[PDB]
Design a protein around this ligand. Structure first.
Ligand SMILES: O[C@@H]1[C@@H](O)[C@H](O[C@@H]2CO[C@@H](O[C@@H]3CO[C@@H](O)[C@H](O)[C@H]3O)[C@H](O)[C@H]2O)OC[C@H]1O
Ligand SMILES: [Ca+2]
Length: 129
């Protein structure tokens, strides 16, 4: 063990490494934190996520004023592209909605990377079989 499950919420602020000089962790009104001040080409890595025996869907709780994408990659921002979440505008960086995307079947313990194409605030993400 010593391993977050893919099937419970992974807090987006709980990255192990990241690229993006302007990236902030900040607190949410209802409790907890989220990541934000994201720009194109920023990424975060979440070490040792246990995808167990298969996940084929990702859900992210996100907020943004303009449609944007989050790529879900293996290992590094240059790794295998498992899928892309096409994030709709929610009207506000404070209005959060759960958004889902399919991914290639992913199993076992993996390092997961989210790669951003523009501004978005992210509370958590989770996978489903
Ligand atoms: O309540 C706070 C949120 O509103 C805050 O959202 C940030 C708002 O600023 C965003 O940056 C703008 C994106 O578009 C660019 O063209 C502008 O130059 C930027 O300033 C940023 O992406 C959001 O995260 O987040 C923190 C909350 O406390
Ligand atoms: Ca969070």
């Amino acid at each position: 063990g010593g391993t977050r499950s893919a099937f419970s919420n992974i807090q987006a602020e709980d990255y192990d490494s990241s690229y993006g000089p302007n990236l902030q962790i900040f607190s949410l009104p209802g409790g907890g934190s989220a990541i934000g001040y994201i720009e194109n080409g920023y990424s975060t890595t979440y070490k040792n996520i246990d995808f167990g025996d298969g996940a084929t869907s990702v859900t992210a709780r996100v907020a943004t004023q303009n449609a944007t994408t989050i790529q879900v990659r293996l290992g590094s921002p240059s790794g295998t592209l498992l899928g892309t979440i096409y994030v709709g505008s929610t009207g506000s960086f404070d209005t959060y909605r759960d958004v889902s995307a399919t991914i290639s079947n992913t199993a076992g313990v993996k390092d997961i990377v989210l790669v951003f194409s523009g501004p978005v605030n992210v509370d958590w993400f989770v996978f489903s079989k």
